[PDB]
């Protein structure tokens, strides 16, 4: 398994078309992870198209109380 | 009130469990401790370096060589150890400046999140900030940010203004929404439809200027009183 | 605002000793200096990656603008991505990109320019289609005129003021966007901060390389020349003087890199705060998100930095 990347050439992992969140940063948008060891292009996030129109409004009908920690 | 209290209690229990189970969340203070220990360990270990001299033991250098050359060797040892010590001090100064910046940020967070409610978005956690709670930790502080998060949204048809008797009525505090046949005025962050009256709307101008203005009646509370 | 500098790494033994093994053996007597240099540079690199991540990765969703781009007369073509352009960069972003130009290595950044462009496009789509609601929870759509009426009401001006002269406000906004594009394309020193970052890095590297030709009080600056013209007993002295000079130069370089990394980290923290408090919401802090009463801000990606349109 030999893969050529922008940061260098990586030996020991195979490139996978599937995209996951970054696990071990490599460089130039490529990350490696252990599922054997695989290399992939990191995914920024899940796409979400907002239903925009000039006469539609979305109003929340409920709420949730959230607690988060900052260190 | 009961639902909000239950949600708050469940959230606190969940936070306790999450800290109990996730080790990597509390990694910043551990990194501080590791950095200090590693720097001190490296400084100690540097003592066993020859620094270009023949021996790393100072008294061995005195004893095994003549003083004319032992002095040069000891000068090399002394300058090497001074270089090591000043490198340690410089790195400590830089790290101390970083920690001072972090502590200033922590004090600002305390003042603006714990001692009051902050309108700054994302400063006191994700969502609309309600209140915060401080907790002490080794070499640091932990904040418990309580936030309000909207949920279960619903589609509505909205209009900038309502045209009535040739007058344009704008929402005093809320927005105009319609469920398909009737129009109501509701507050922006929570769905509470209400009858559009003259008490929760204000009039400004005629209907030929506003774009998207729609036709609907506006109830007047006073009319039934003098009707009788 | 600058966000990150270039991730650089140095080969200690290669920089100081070339291809001489005796020089490396002599260096082995000096302890773990090269180890400290490696640790410092690795920390700087991961710090740069973290700076970019904190500044730009503020949303967990990738929002898309609707195909029908009519927002009540407001023209956003100058800041929205250009599908015709292969790089999918906005015209202002393209102008910004155009206007900014051994033993030593430069590590590529973790996030490519396309990913940062996608982040900025997601931020713009979220702040255009959903107002500021997407920064505090689920994205709730709202017509742009009503969002702008919200923002006018935020600064103490009633809704009717905006609704009665919407067309004038839209024309003023479009003219302002055109003027800011022209001002960026005309004034050459507007982007001086990022260029100073690039120039400082290049100058530091060039000075470090140039220092390698200094005699440092020895008879020659060439290592093989000394090893070939002199017998050992004074050769150790000459080589020791050379290698101690080169450790001084390298340590000075690392110290300045650490200080500059701290400065860039402070700038990146400021940029992240500005993103959160001006792009994801409306700020009442005066002179923080531009001169005057703040309405909304638009982010634009730039080399080694970010540009805010207040
Ligand atoms: C409000 O209405 C819009 C459109 O009527 C909804 O958007 C649709 O969502 C479905 C679900 O994926 C898509 O298949 C459609 O293509 C969307 N339509 C448009 C025009 O984008 C939206 O989901 C509704 N909001 C809620 C909360 O139900
Ligand atoms: C808002 O959401 C809460 C939950 O987050 C809803 O509370 C639930 O109500 C149903 C029926 O009343 C109960 O069966 C559930 O056990 C409740 N959940 C909890 C956690 O107690 C509440 O009903 C929602 N409000 C509206 C108007 O839909
Ligand atoms: C929109 O909401 C209004 C008020 O909530 C609805 O009007 C009422 O509808 C109920 C049930 O259909 C009737 O029993 C009432 O008599 C109605 N009130 C009046 C004053 O007419 C209306 O039906 C809703 N429209 C839709 C499409 O759901
Ligand atoms: C809202 O109500 C006004 C007043 O009835 C409507 O204006 C009328 O429009 C019709 C047809 O366009 C004209 O023949 C009348 O002379 C108008 N009356 C006045 C007083 O101007 C208006 O069209 C209504 N809006 C909508 C969308 O139907
Ligand atoms: C929005 O702005 C763009 C450019 O700022 C406008 O595009 C111009 O359109 C006119 C005529 O339609 C052309 O003569 C110009 O050459 C165009 N400029 C550029 C840079 O392409 C556009 O018309 C405006 N309006 C809309 C709805 O997009
Ligand atoms: C909203 O936009 C659609 C198409 O983009 C247009 O047909 C319609 O007239 C617009 N609504 C108003 C009130 O202008």
XYZ file of C-alpha atoms and ligand atoms in Angstrom:
763
model
C 0.000 0.000 0.000
C 1.676 3.163 -1.299
C -0.180 6.483 -1.386
C 1.173 9.782 -2.707
C 0.035 12.875 -0.805
C 0.937 16.552 -0.822
C 2.781 16.303 2.501
C 4.745 13.269 1.315
C 4.271 9.647 0.350
C 2.532 7.489 2.948
C 3.311 3.772 3.173
C 1.215 1.305 5.158
C -2.305 2.647 4.568
C -4.697 2.619 1.618
C -6.744 5.576 0.416
C -10.499 5.304 0.966
C -13.041 7.359 -0.973
C -15.318 7.509 2.075
C -14.993 10.607 4.247
C -14.965 10.671 8.045
C -14.016 13.244 10.656
C -10.287 13.659 11.183
C -8.586 11.223 13.569
C -4.822 11.497 13.000
C -3.935 14.637 11.013
C -1.554 14.086 8.106
C -1.592 17.292 6.059
C -3.262 18.947 3.066
C -6.712 17.788 4.133
C -5.781 14.111 4.546
C -6.224 12.234 7.826
C -5.426 8.663 8.857
C -7.391 6.353 11.133
C -7.558 2.753 12.318
C -10.780 0.920 11.501
C -6.027 -1.957 9.297
C -4.968 1.672 8.847
C -6.814 3.799 6.284
C -6.245 7.259 4.832
C -9.039 9.568 3.718
C -9.961 13.162 2.991
C -11.529 14.647 6.111
C -15.188 15.676 5.982
C -16.040 19.220 7.037
C -19.604 18.365 8.026
C -23.032 17.224 6.945
C -24.678 19.311 4.236
C -27.875 21.132 5.200
C -29.833 23.265 2.742
C -32.071 25.824 4.452
C -35.537 26.164 2.908
C -35.267 29.886 2.216
C -38.197 31.774 0.736
C -39.299 35.385 0.951
C -42.516 34.707 2.888
C -41.706 31.759 5.194
C -40.637 31.869 8.846
C -39.605 29.098 11.240
C -40.629 29.594 14.876
C -39.558 27.219 17.675
C -42.429 25.532 19.486
C -40.319 24.126 22.344
C -36.930 24.398 24.020
C -34.226 22.416 25.787
C -31.959 23.460 28.654
C -28.318 22.736 27.835
C -25.327 22.600 30.187
C -21.778 22.642 28.810
C -18.315 22.685 30.367
C -15.419 25.027 29.630
C -11.976 24.325 31.087
C -41.410 25.430 35.628
C -41.446 21.700 36.416
C -40.263 20.766 32.919
C -37.430 23.313 33.034
C -36.331 22.096 36.468
C -36.357 18.473 35.293
C -34.327 19.347 32.194
C -31.793 21.238 34.317
C -31.402 18.343 36.765
C -31.020 15.824 33.939
C -28.427 18.039 32.252
C -26.353 18.318 35.433
C -26.455 14.555 35.954
C -25.437 14.045 32.330
C -22.480 16.419 32.745
C -21.344 14.551 35.849
C -21.491 11.241 33.973
C -19.721 12.688 30.919
C -16.824 13.973 33.013
C -16.729 10.625 34.827
C -16.479 8.692 31.541
C -14.577 10.903 29.074
C -10.870 11.286 29.966
C -9.780 13.566 27.116
C -12.144 16.418 28.045
C -9.949 17.502 30.987
C -6.724 17.487 28.997
C -5.698 21.148 29.186
C -4.688 21.125 32.857
C -2.986 17.771 32.307
C -1.037 19.317 29.425
C 0.038 22.180 31.695
C 1.262 19.723 34.334
C 3.033 17.586 31.729
C 4.749 20.607 30.178
C 6.067 21.802 33.535
C 7.265 18.335 34.550
C 8.885 17.671 31.167
C 10.740 20.993 31.141
C 12.031 20.460 34.678
C 13.068 16.882 33.861
C 14.948 18.016 30.750
C 16.718 20.723 32.753
C 17.811 18.152 35.342
C 18.915 15.642 32.701
C 21.002 18.290 30.924
C 23.517 18.187 33.800
C 25.044 14.935 32.500
C 26.178 16.513 29.206
C 29.848 16.974 28.349
C 29.145 20.255 26.495
C 32.220 19.614 24.357
C 34.532 18.926 27.302
C 36.280 15.635 28.004
C 34.205 14.778 31.089
C 30.773 15.614 32.469
C 32.027 15.447 36.084
C 33.516 18.719 37.298
C 35.659 17.313 40.112
C 36.895 14.564 37.784
C 38.007 17.327 35.405
C 39.839 19.112 38.227
C 41.525 15.895 39.342
C 42.455 14.180 36.068
C 43.799 17.278 34.256
C 46.180 20.098 35.040
C 44.480 23.317 36.224
C 45.626 25.296 33.136
C 43.439 23.097 30.895
C 40.930 22.063 33.556
C 40.008 25.745 33.790
C 39.166 25.872 30.071
C 37.145 22.657 30.378
C 35.264 24.022 33.405
C 34.589 27.256 31.522
C 33.009 25.153 28.778
C 30.918 23.299 31.367
C 29.821 26.542 33.038
C 28.826 28.234 29.792
C 26.906 25.134 28.708
C 24.983 24.975 31.974
C 24.236 28.710 31.868
C 22.918 28.255 28.325
C 20.684 25.399 29.483
C 19.376 27.412 32.428
C 18.629 30.506 30.347
C 16.844 28.389 27.734
C 14.696 26.920 30.503
C 13.972 30.390 31.904
C 13.046 31.808 28.488
C 10.650 28.953 27.741
C 9.156 29.383 31.215
C 8.643 33.098 30.553
C 6.836 32.425 27.271
C 4.652 29.746 28.864
C 3.911 32.094 31.773
C 2.772 34.790 29.347
C 0.435 32.280 27.702
C -0.953 31.221 31.092
C -1.437 34.880 32.029
C -3.506 35.404 28.887
C -5.561 32.314 29.741
C -6.097 33.507 33.323
C -7.188 36.944 32.117
C -9.710 35.231 29.847
C -10.894 33.094 32.773
C -11.372 36.153 34.991
C -13.342 37.889 32.239
C -15.485 34.769 31.843
C -16.137 34.704 35.592
C -17.138 38.364 35.714
C -19.311 38.329 32.588
C -20.885 34.866 32.798
C -21.149 34.039 36.519
C -21.753 37.497 38.002
C -24.229 38.412 35.264
C -26.004 37.346 32.098
C -24.041 37.894 28.890
C -25.496 38.954 25.546
C -22.214 38.132 23.794
C -22.931 35.108 21.620
C -20.797 31.968 22.141
C -18.876 33.667 24.967
C -20.671 31.687 27.705
C -21.403 28.517 25.769
C -23.419 27.443 22.747
C -26.944 28.849 22.728
C -28.628 31.710 24.521
C -26.846 32.161 27.843
C -28.905 31.930 31.029
C -26.442 31.486 33.912
C -23.107 29.868 34.714
C -21.515 28.055 37.649
C -17.805 27.980 38.573
C -15.936 24.897 39.743
C -12.344 24.667 40.934
C -9.879 22.289 39.284
C -6.139 21.646 39.710
C -4.302 24.575 38.095
C -7.520 25.874 36.563
C -11.243 26.534 36.725
C -14.242 24.765 35.184
C -17.383 26.611 34.094
C -20.844 25.049 33.820
C -22.679 27.154 31.230
C -26.475 26.843 31.351
C -27.948 27.818 27.987
C -31.353 27.991 26.323
C -31.590 26.088 23.032
C -34.673 26.272 20.771
C -36.143 23.049 19.437
C -39.047 21.661 17.399
C -39.442 24.471 14.891
C -42.487 24.819 12.656
C -43.150 26.454 9.295
C -45.290 29.572 9.039
C -46.187 32.175 6.432
C -45.156 35.672 7.479
C -45.903 39.230 6.383
C -43.956 42.425 7.142
C -47.125 44.363 8.013
C -50.924 44.190 8.094
C -53.037 46.598 6.045
C -56.254 47.722 7.738
C -58.416 50.726 6.803
C -55.591 51.921 4.581
C -53.188 51.920 7.537
C -50.091 49.765 7.962
C -49.743 48.018 11.326
C -46.329 46.716 12.369
C -45.683 44.223 15.191
C -44.798 45.963 18.437
C -42.565 43.177 19.771
C -43.252 39.992 17.802
C -43.839 38.910 14.207
C -46.895 38.188 12.076
C -47.468 34.501 11.299
C -50.288 32.571 9.643
C -51.292 28.922 9.971
C -53.007 28.979 6.570
C -56.219 30.929 7.138
C -55.805 33.234 10.157
C -53.026 35.635 11.113
C -51.522 35.954 14.585
C -48.693 37.866 16.233
C -46.179 35.849 18.232
C -42.908 36.439 20.030
C -39.887 35.509 17.959
C -38.250 32.848 20.141
C -41.384 30.895 21.121
C -44.650 30.075 19.384
C -47.445 31.870 21.243
C -50.052 32.915 18.654
C -52.285 35.791 19.717
C -55.078 37.843 18.186
C -53.758 40.892 16.340
C -55.112 43.939 18.187
C -54.236 47.625 18.289
C -52.426 47.138 21.608
C -49.660 44.871 20.270
C -49.225 46.721 16.949
C -48.345 50.290 16.005
C -49.543 52.219 12.956
C -47.157 53.963 10.557
C -48.232 55.363 7.200
C -50.437 53.932 4.481
C -50.317 50.602 2.631
C -48.816 51.705 -0.699
C -45.164 51.807 0.450
C -44.477 48.544 2.291
C -43.595 45.601 0.044
C -45.389 42.377 0.911
C -48.071 43.984 3.083
C -51.184 41.818 3.376
C -54.866 42.527 4.061
C -56.349 41.529 7.411
C -58.550 42.935 10.149
C -57.137 44.316 13.402
C -59.311 43.943 16.491
C -60.068 47.020 18.598
C -60.789 46.241 22.276
C -62.642 49.510 22.882
C -65.456 48.996 20.341
C -67.513 46.450 22.367
C -67.403 48.732 25.422
C -69.221 51.650 23.806
C -71.268 49.224 21.704
C -73.303 48.409 24.826
C -6.520 39.804 10.852
C -3.712 37.232 10.556
C -4.622 33.752 11.777
C -1.671 31.418 11.214
C 1.870 31.392 9.869
C 3.723 28.653 7.995
C 4.472 25.357 9.732
C 8.268 25.060 9.552
C 10.622 22.268 10.625
C 14.426 22.194 10.778
C 16.860 19.290 10.506
C 19.297 20.007 13.330
C 22.147 17.669 12.370
C 21.721 18.315 8.635
C 21.668 22.089 9.134
C 24.732 22.186 11.356
C 26.952 19.386 10.038
C 26.179 18.677 6.389
C 27.443 15.202 5.557
C 30.199 14.869 8.200
C 29.740 12.035 10.700
C 32.473 13.319 13.034
C 30.504 16.546 13.396
C 27.435 14.535 14.421
C 29.519 12.555 16.916
C 30.748 15.829 18.419
C 27.169 17.135 18.496
C 26.140 14.044 20.469
C 28.142 15.422 23.421
C 25.909 18.517 23.700
C 22.829 16.766 25.080
C 19.295 16.942 23.690
C 19.289 20.438 22.169
C 17.979 19.218 18.813
C 15.226 17.394 20.712
C 14.127 20.650 22.356
C 14.144 22.412 18.989
C 12.020 19.645 17.470
C 9.534 19.814 20.347
C 9.243 23.600 20.096
C 8.678 23.546 16.336
C 6.133 20.720 16.587
C 4.243 22.674 19.233
C 4.253 25.727 16.975
C 2.895 23.703 14.044
C 0.067 22.083 16.000
C -0.711 25.529 17.426
C -1.084 26.946 13.907
C -3.455 24.129 12.978
C -5.477 24.746 16.147
C -5.608 28.474 15.366
C -7.126 27.828 11.949
C -9.552 25.265 13.383
C -10.825 27.583 16.122
C -11.175 30.567 13.803
C -12.984 28.892 10.905
C -14.664 25.708 12.167
C -17.517 27.419 14.031
C -20.414 25.464 12.471
C -21.081 21.725 12.346
C -23.323 22.046 9.269
C -22.520 22.990 5.678
C -25.303 25.346 4.625
C -26.197 25.963 0.980
C -27.703 29.068 -0.576
C -30.908 28.522 -2.565
C -30.551 28.477 -6.359
C -32.870 31.502 -6.632
C -30.693 34.260 -5.165
C -33.152 37.109 -4.673
C -33.025 38.669 -1.200
C -35.322 41.668 -1.500
C -33.016 43.727 -3.707
C -29.819 42.937 -1.812
C -26.958 41.905 -4.096
C -24.583 39.311 -2.666
C -22.741 38.177 -5.808
C -19.480 39.802 -4.719
C -19.217 37.637 -1.586
C -20.993 34.418 -2.576
C -18.944 31.618 -4.179
C -18.577 31.713 -7.949
C -19.609 28.383 -9.536
C -17.903 29.297 -12.820
C -14.543 29.691 -11.087
C -12.941 26.231 -10.699
C -11.715 27.063 -7.183
C -15.225 28.167 -6.085
C -13.954 31.421 -4.576
C -15.888 34.660 -4.310
C -14.642 37.616 -6.394
C -13.451 39.440 -3.270
C -11.764 36.245 -2.081
C -10.125 35.831 -5.495
C -8.857 39.422 -5.364
C -7.500 38.853 -1.848
C -5.738 35.683 -2.993
C -4.217 37.503 -5.967
C -3.038 40.543 -3.986
C -0.973 38.542 -1.445
C 2.082 36.573 -2.555
C 19.278 23.014 2.928
C 17.959 21.477 6.138
C 14.895 23.740 6.407
C 11.432 22.461 5.497
C 7.934 23.944 5.361
C 5.055 21.685 6.381
C 1.752 22.046 4.482
C -1.240 23.192 6.541
C -3.840 20.651 7.594
C -6.727 22.596 6.013
C -6.426 23.372 2.314
C -7.725 26.623 0.856
C -10.775 24.862 -0.594
C -11.856 23.695 2.866
C -11.558 27.207 4.307
C -13.531 28.493 1.321
C -16.235 25.918 2.079
C -16.304 27.045 5.716
C -16.696 30.697 4.719
C -19.419 29.789 2.217
C -21.275 27.855 4.919
C -20.997 30.837 7.268
C -22.340 33.193 4.591
C -25.220 30.886 3.669
C -26.180 30.451 7.314
C -26.067 34.167 8.078
C -27.992 35.067 4.907
C -30.750 32.446 4.939
C -31.222 31.972 8.699
C -30.002 35.212 10.278
C -28.261 34.640 13.603
C -30.425 31.702 14.697
C -28.000 29.126 13.295
C -25.270 30.229 15.709
C -27.394 29.376 18.754
C -29.148 26.180 17.656
C -31.080 24.873 14.664
C -31.101 27.136 11.630
C -34.500 28.813 11.250
C -35.107 30.486 7.906
C -36.370 34.067 7.720
C -36.843 36.505 4.807
C -33.864 38.817 4.485
C -35.902 42.064 4.742
C -37.367 40.845 8.038
C -33.914 39.875 9.298
C -32.649 43.346 8.428
C -35.669 44.825 10.214
C -34.668 42.758 13.252
C -31.157 44.179 13.028
C -32.450 47.742 12.672
C -34.623 47.202 15.743
C -31.492 46.002 17.526
C -29.847 49.421 17.207
C -32.897 51.385 18.361
C -34.534 52.128 14.996
C -38.077 50.915 14.405
C -39.162 48.475 11.701
C -41.154 51.012 9.680
C -37.965 52.972 8.986
C -36.511 50.030 7.071
C -39.754 48.838 5.505
C -40.656 52.275 4.133
C -37.310 52.759 2.337
C -36.104 49.207 1.685
C -35.030 49.988 -1.884
C -32.814 52.888 -0.801
C -31.107 50.692 1.803
C -30.533 47.923 -0.744
C -29.043 50.388 -3.234
C -26.754 51.831 -0.558
C -25.575 48.351 0.448
C -24.858 47.376 -3.162
C -22.942 50.607 -3.765
C -20.931 50.049 -0.582
C -19.988 46.519 -1.662
C -18.876 47.768 -5.070
C -16.867 50.569 -3.475
C -15.123 48.231 -1.027
C -14.195 45.903 -3.884
C -12.728 48.837 -5.814
C -10.891 50.100 -2.720
C -9.295 46.699 -2.153
C -8.381 46.421 -5.843
C -6.833 49.918 -5.879
C -5.059 50.625 -2.572
C -1.945 48.402 -2.483
C -1.146 48.525 1.250
C -4.600 47.497 2.506
C -3.438 43.884 3.011
C -0.212 44.759 4.814
C -0.603 42.458 7.818
C -0.613 39.139 5.952
C 2.221 40.332 3.711
C 4.244 41.289 6.794
C 3.643 37.793 8.168
C 4.928 36.213 4.951
C 7.881 38.604 4.728
C 8.878 38.044 8.364
C 8.903 34.281 7.865
C 10.908 34.507 4.639
C 13.397 36.942 6.178
C 13.902 34.735 9.238
C 14.549 31.654 7.104
C 16.888 33.543 4.768
C 18.844 34.990 7.693
C 19.194 31.537 9.248
C 20.466 30.150 5.935
C 22.856 33.077 5.422
C 24.285 32.608 8.926
C 25.648 29.231 7.803
C 28.442 30.953 5.845
C 29.829 32.800 8.891
C 33.300 31.822 10.091
C 32.337 32.419 13.755
C 35.972 33.100 14.609
C 37.271 29.911 12.989
C 39.822 29.704 10.193
C 37.196 28.631 7.647
C 33.429 28.335 7.309
C 33.647 25.069 5.331
C 33.514 21.940 7.474
C 35.181 19.602 4.966
C 37.914 22.187 4.381
C 38.855 22.121 8.072
C 38.573 18.336 8.246
C 40.842 18.003 5.192
C 43.481 20.657 5.962
C 44.055 20.122 9.703
C 44.932 17.235 11.983
C 42.448 16.277 14.749
C 43.783 17.935 17.903
C 43.018 21.509 16.811
C 40.294 20.292 14.443
C 38.105 19.515 17.449
C 38.608 23.098 18.663
C 37.727 24.642 15.297
C 34.694 22.397 14.811
C 33.562 23.078 18.380
C 33.619 26.819 17.744
C 31.652 26.382 14.503
C 29.013 24.100 16.027
C 28.520 26.295 19.094
C 27.973 29.282 16.796
C 25.436 27.305 14.790
C 23.578 26.216 17.925
C 23.443 29.868 18.992
C 21.971 30.892 15.618
C 19.441 28.054 15.599
C 18.345 28.712 19.185
C 17.873 32.408 18.407
C 15.714 31.462 15.422
C 13.585 29.136 17.555
C 13.106 31.791 20.250
C 11.919 34.397 17.749
C 9.613 31.794 16.205
C 8.087 31.109 19.627
C 7.488 34.814 20.278
C 5.916 35.310 16.847
C 3.762 32.223 17.403
C 2.455 33.749 20.629
C 1.643 36.989 18.797
C -0.140 35.126 15.992
C -2.077 33.075 18.550
C -3.314 36.269 20.200
C -4.377 37.603 16.798
C -6.154 34.329 15.982
C -8.023 34.389 19.294
C -9.158 37.927 18.499
C -10.256 36.796 15.031
C -12.255 33.890 16.469
C -13.963 36.227 18.938
C -14.782 38.632 16.103
C -16.225 35.796 14.014
C -18.415 34.568 16.862
C -19.640 37.983 18.005
C -20.083 39.791 14.675
C -20.892 37.051 12.152
C -23.055 34.764 14.301
C -24.827 37.694 15.941
C -25.240 41.435 16.306
C -22.843 43.148 18.704
C -23.636 46.090 20.974
C -19.933 46.597 21.721
C -19.059 49.915 20.107
C -16.135 50.027 17.637
C -15.708 46.239 17.895
C -17.337 45.170 14.602
C -16.710 48.369 12.661
C -17.250 52.096 13.018
C -20.859 53.041 13.698
C -23.828 50.979 14.774
C -23.203 47.361 13.803
C -25.719 45.494 11.649
C -24.040 42.368 10.250
C -20.656 41.079 9.123
C -19.469 38.803 6.323
C -16.278 36.703 6.495
C -13.842 36.291 3.625
C -10.900 33.904 3.580
C -7.431 35.283 2.857
C -3.931 33.759 2.796
C -2.775 33.273 6.407
C -5.738 35.268 7.678
C -9.378 36.282 7.476
C -11.130 39.413 6.192
C -14.302 40.784 7.781
C -16.786 42.978 5.907
C -18.548 44.997 8.615
C -40.892 24.078 5.612
O -41.254 23.887 4.248
C -40.147 23.588 3.387
C -40.702 23.515 1.984
O -42.108 23.309 1.992
C -39.475 22.292 3.836
O -38.318 22.067 3.041
C -38.432 20.797 2.369
O -37.823 19.743 3.124
C -37.930 18.453 2.503
C -37.325 17.456 3.462
O -35.999 17.113 3.085
C -37.233 18.472 1.144
O -37.415 17.212 0.508
C -37.802 19.583 0.274
O -37.061 19.681 -0.938
C -37.747 20.917 1.010
N -38.355 21.968 0.211
C -37.698 23.070 -0.169
C -38.481 24.051 -0.989
O -36.526 23.266 0.137
C -39.077 22.384 5.304
O -38.589 21.125 5.755
C -40.270 22.798 6.160
N -39.869 22.966 7.547
C -40.252 22.138 8.524
C -39.744 22.462 9.897
O -40.974 21.170 8.310
C -41.441 20.005 24.733
O -40.489 18.946 24.885
C -40.642 18.194 26.097
C -39.509 17.195 26.135
O -38.261 17.821 25.876
C -42.019 17.539 26.125
O -42.185 16.833 27.350
C -42.656 15.503 27.050
O -44.090 15.457 27.031
C -44.623 14.163 26.710
C -46.125 14.313 26.655
O -46.563 15.430 27.418
C -44.164 13.138 27.746
O -44.632 11.849 27.368
C -42.645 13.133 27.849
O -42.230 12.271 28.902
C -42.126 14.542 28.111
N -40.674 14.554 28.151
C -39.978 14.711 29.282
C -38.486 14.697 29.142
O -40.528 14.858 30.368
C -43.098 18.601 25.977
O -44.380 17.989 25.898
C -42.855 19.428 24.721
N -43.846 20.484 24.604
C -44.650 20.616 23.544
C -45.613 21.763 23.589
O -44.601 19.845 22.591
C -55.582 28.545 12.409
O -55.803 28.839 13.791
C -57.125 29.313 14.087
C -57.151 29.621 15.566
O -56.322 28.727 16.296
C -58.163 28.270 13.681
O -59.465 28.810 13.879
C -60.211 27.944 14.759
O -60.192 26.587 14.299
C -60.905 25.678 15.151
C -60.704 24.295 14.577
O -60.670 24.323 13.158
C -62.374 26.085 15.231
O -63.051 25.221 16.135
C -62.495 27.529 15.699
O -63.855 27.942 15.649
C -61.653 28.446 14.817
N -61.710 29.815 15.304
C -62.245 30.816 14.599
C -62.220 32.165 15.254
O -62.729 30.643 13.486
C -57.982 27.878 12.221
O -58.859 26.806 11.893
C -56.543 27.450 11.960
N -56.351 27.124 10.557
C -55.742 26.007 10.146
C -55.629 25.828 8.663
O -55.302 25.179 10.937
C -56.472 44.951 0.051
O -57.636 45.781 0.165
C -57.623 46.928 -0.698
C -58.863 47.729 -0.378
O -60.044 46.987 -0.649
C -57.560 46.476 -2.154
O -57.488 47.615 -3.002
C -58.510 47.501 -4.013
O -58.044 46.756 -5.146
C -59.031 46.587 -6.174
C -58.405 45.720 -7.241
O -56.992 45.874 -7.269
C -59.477 47.950 -6.699
O -60.512 47.769 -7.658
C -59.974 48.822 -5.554
O -60.268 50.131 -6.028
C -58.920 48.903 -4.454
N -59.413 49.684 -3.331
C -58.728 50.700 -2.795
C -59.383 51.397 -1.640
O -57.630 51.041 -3.223
C -56.346 45.582 -2.370
O -56.349 45.067 -3.696
C -56.355 44.426 -1.378
N -55.162 43.609 -1.537
C -55.169 42.415 -2.135
C -53.849 41.711 -2.212
O -56.195 41.924 -2.591
C -25.724 42.119 -8.791
O -24.397 42.613 -8.999
C -23.750 42.095 -10.170
C -22.344 42.644 -10.166
O -22.113 43.467 -9.032
C -24.541 42.493 -11.410
O -23.918 41.930 -12.559
C -23.805 42.953 -13.567
O -24.939 42.930 -14.441
C -24.910 43.948 -15.452
C -26.210 43.841 -16.215
O -27.015 42.780 -15.719
C -23.681 43.765 -16.338
O -23.623 44.830 -17.280
C -22.415 43.752 -15.490
O -21.290 43.444 -16.305
C -22.530 42.719 -14.374
N -21.355 42.760 -13.520
C -20.614 41.681 -13.246
C -19.435 41.905 -12.349
O -20.885 40.574 -13.700
C -25.976 41.997 -11.291
O -26.749 42.464 -12.389
C -26.605 42.488 -9.989
N -27.959 41.973 -9.842
C -28.268 40.672 -9.761
C -29.726 40.358 -9.615
O -27.416 39.789 -9.800
C -40.858 35.987 -3.665
O -40.013 35.451 -4.685
C -40.732 34.858 -5.774
C -39.701 34.256 -6.700
O -38.387 34.417 -6.181
C -41.604 35.911 -6.454
O -42.371 35.291 -7.479
C -42.528 36.569 -5.438
O -43.238 37.642 -6.047
C -41.726 37.098 -4.250
N -42.613 37.652 -3.241
C -42.800 38.967 -3.073
C -43.748 39.361 -1.982
O -42.227 39.798 -3.770
